[PDB]
Write a protein that binds this ligand. Structure first.
Ligand SMILES: CC[C@H]1OC(=O)[C@H](C)[C@@H](O[C@@H]2C[C@@](C)(OC)[C@@H](O)[C@H](C)O2)[C@H](C)[C@@H](O[C@@H]2O[C@H](C)C[C@H](N(C)C)[C@H]2O)[C@@](C)(O)C[C@@H](C)C(=O)[C@H](C)[C@@H](O)[C@@]1(C)O
Lengths: 51, 49, 103
RNA sequence: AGCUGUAAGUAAGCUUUGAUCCAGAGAUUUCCGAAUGGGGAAACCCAGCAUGAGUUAUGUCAUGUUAUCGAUAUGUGAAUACAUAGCAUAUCAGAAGGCACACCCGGAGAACUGAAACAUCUUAGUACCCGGAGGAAGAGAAAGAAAAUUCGAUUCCCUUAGUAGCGGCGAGCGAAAUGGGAAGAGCCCAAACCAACAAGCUUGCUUGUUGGGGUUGUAGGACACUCUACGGAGUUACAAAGGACGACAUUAGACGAAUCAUCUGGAAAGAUGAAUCAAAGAAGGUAAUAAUCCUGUAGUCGAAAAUGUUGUCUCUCUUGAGUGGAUCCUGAGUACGACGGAGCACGUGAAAUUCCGUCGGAAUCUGGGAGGACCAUCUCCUAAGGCUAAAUACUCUCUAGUGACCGAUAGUGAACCAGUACCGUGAGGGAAAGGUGAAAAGCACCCCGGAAGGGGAGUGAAAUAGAACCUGAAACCGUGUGCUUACAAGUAGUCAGAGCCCGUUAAUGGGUGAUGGCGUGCCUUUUGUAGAAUGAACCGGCGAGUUACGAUUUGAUGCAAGGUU
RNA sequence: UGAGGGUAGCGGAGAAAUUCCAAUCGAACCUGGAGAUAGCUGGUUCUCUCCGAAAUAGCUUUAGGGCUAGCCUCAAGUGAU
RNA sequence: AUGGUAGGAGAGCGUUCUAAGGGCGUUGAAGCAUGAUCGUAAGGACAUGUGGAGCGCUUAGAAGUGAGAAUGCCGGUGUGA
RNA sequence: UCGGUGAAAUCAUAGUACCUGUGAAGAUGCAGGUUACCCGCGACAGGACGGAAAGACCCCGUGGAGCUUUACUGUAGCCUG
């Protein structure tokens, strides 16, 4: 949704994985990925700010 | 500064000075009465002899 | 990181699996030398105080990355950490306790 | 726990009593050079004064001192009498020179050029020169900008706008207000007036010294009128805690997880297989391509010069005194004007506005200035006194880093012996030149030879990797051979074609060529070039429509009476 | 004829020749403005496909340059002209 | 229908680099040399020798993107002999 | 001539004949004929419009410079107020 330093630090060192905020989404790191896991809150946030 | 131009009737320009009207007079500097240069406009009401 | 009077194993080279004792280190280019390891064959000429001499077989240096200490308990190859004791610093094995080495 | 610079090891040695090294502090620091005892052809010569060593004595040597201007304290005193000039001492070290002249402020100030010539204009207040200071400088608190019902001292950014305007109305030059924003700070003098101090004067007044007081307009202050001060507390100017002041960056520094085996190999980090760590899969080395071998990384713990300069921070602060303003004060050779000039977007003239020189030369609150000649009514302001942080400009430098930047004719002129060999009397100009190998294991020994060179042997994975050392192209120079050539006229090839030799990316193949036919190179410039018109000795390398900003027009996409920051 | 010195480029020196001022002078040399300007000359790098000129009026301090028209090409449109 | 210089339009080949994906390499990469191979062209593969560590392919994107000529610059090397 | 040492200008490639013609109007290279075994050395100078020097004569450039004057425009300076 906004920021989780713990999950960011957990996923930082894995290859292929990237971590982003709903506000900080970008087309490049969306399209480079093959899958997209969201939290429900982040999904609702992007839904409201893009709808 | 004291620099500018002299202009012709065809407005040709040449560099030129404007010199002050210095006069040598004996004034009373701090100490003795010294003979020194000074302008007429200056000694008009600016200094005594 | 090691010292002069240690017993170690060679990981990389023509000699690998071999053990040996270290006899010099040369830290400013990180190339130690070990007995029975990396043997040259120098052509010797007549020096001022010796005969001509044929070939000469002595040791040559070897990079430190190609050498590892041995756990004194298990005699297995192990890295080395550090432990502070009363302001003094000692070497540990990362699998067991202390490793004693003075010569 | 090794060490005795880059540049190597011998001989000598030093080192756990803590060396070499890494930061901080201190001592020493020859000579020249602003160079400063005098001189001088820089890195040299020649002195003196006072101490000290030595000397029977000098000689010699050593240690300090001896420049010019200036500041602070003194006496002094010629043509001519005290006085001062001037001169002579004691103390201090205040300046000089060099700036990074990149940025900033002043003084002085071009020409090529464009206008398709050229002179007003432009290039351009540019380049260069000189002087100043500084880490910033400059500007700065309305005698304003504007005409709303107004506004925030200065500076900077975006717009206004290539507009308004200037202009041989040509080339071209080119604002401002308004608005949106960054940063946001108003403080002190002179004069009135009051109270003391000394001299003239007779202490009445004046002069000057000190201290308060107050520095602003729909008028402020003094006198006239009226009742309050550390409440707040602010060192970026305007006063200050100088304060226990509570991580400089917490900076040198220290710790810092996790891998084994087999195959090929000269050597594996590679392939195969099985495991592990991850707040660490950034990067670089290691005999080849490594998250788990090394240095390291994330992260944690950390001390001197230190404090982050940050939080109540002792003292000290500013808890305001409101009305009329009637009288007094409110910056003089000033404002302003004429003449000649310059700067303002403005071409010198109606110059309104702001500066220089020469001549003149005022008003004082019922005053004065501005509002693009000038007059009147209205609006705004109150000059001729000063200081002022921030936002802003540049980088010889430093620390930490980054790149659809170069990779040895590139990129700095310079990856190495660089502003060096070299050239020039001198100012100045100014190169070429990188790569053995993992490891020096850098070829013991034998043979030819005066040696250089080589042939063996040997090291090595490799020696057509041997220091003229990675790869090793072409021009050029050679040695061998298969086909061919001494009756022949030639842009040297092309189409045809026997004979001879070979045998491929195996397909109606390759090499040579007795003989026949056709046939005057390339480029540029030209009406037209084989051209006796140009250019090229050959080979290699380098070597020319690009980028920014704006306009216009096509294509694409999004939205659409709206579109866009 | 020697040794020390002096005169410097909008200048100097010249028994005068445009003569000399570091192998150069009708205005020295080095740096900078400066990548001056050049309506002039030379050069300007890979391939195929489609179309395909002009060397002419007119104005020009203009004549080996330039502007507009003519003639070329590409794309839309009108649509018998 | 398809000759073509100034010139206009169009479609393509190669070079260096970047992103992503997917690959090749000491059982030997790029470079160099040879060849009787493929493609309408620019040009692309394969095989063998040499060499001894990096390099292709697909799609897109950026350019210091292609030399035989400039009395061109720098190096090597000839001719005259 | 022999022994030692050993350059340079120039140079599109070259197996580089003559006559009469042709042609950018003066040909080793073109046409038609004539002649001519391959390769050197010593000599000569008719041609290669030979080499050398982006013609200095001539014209052009809205290119420069030097000098002249009753060319235009200015000016240091001089005279007078
Ligand atoms: C000694 C040393 C010199 O000898 C000469 O000067 C000879 C003596 C000239 O004779 C002549 C002699 C004299 C009478 O001329 C015939 C005179 O008129 C000219 C000026 O110099 C020559 C040949 C000239 O040629 C002629 O120059 C003329 C301008 C055009 C003429 N053209 C027909 C092709 C051409 O051949 C021209 C200028 O010198 C040659 C240039 C390259 C030189 O300056 C060369 C390098 C000289 O330094 C030279 C070698 O050193």
């Amino acid at each position: 949704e906004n920021e989780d330093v713990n999950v960011e630090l957990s996923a930082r060192n894995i290859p292929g994985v990237q971590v982003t905020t709903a506000q900080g989404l970008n087309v490049l790191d969306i399209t480079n990925a093959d899958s997209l896991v969201i939290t429900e809150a982040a999904a609702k946030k992007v839904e409201e700010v893009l709808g | 500064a004291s620099t500018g131009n002299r202009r012709s009737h065809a407005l040709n320009s040449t560099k030129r000075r404007w010199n002050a009207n210095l006069q040598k007079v004996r004034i009373l500097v701090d100490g003795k009465p010294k003979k020194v240069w000074v302008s007429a406009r200056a000694l008009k009401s600016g200094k005594v002899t | 990181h090691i010292k002069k009077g240690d017993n170690v194993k060679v990981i990389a080279g023509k000699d690998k699996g071999k053990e040996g004792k270290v006899i010099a280190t040369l830290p400013k280019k990180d190339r130690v030398v070990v007995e029975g390891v990396n043997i040259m064959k120098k052509h010797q000429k007549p020096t001022q105080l010796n005969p001509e001499g044929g070939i000469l077989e002595t040791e040559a240096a070897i990079h430190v990355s190609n050498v590892q200490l041995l756990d004194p308990k298990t005699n297995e190859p192990t890295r080395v950490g550090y432990k502070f004791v009363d302001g003094k610093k000692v070497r540990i094995a990362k699998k067991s306790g202390e490793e004693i080495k003075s010569n």
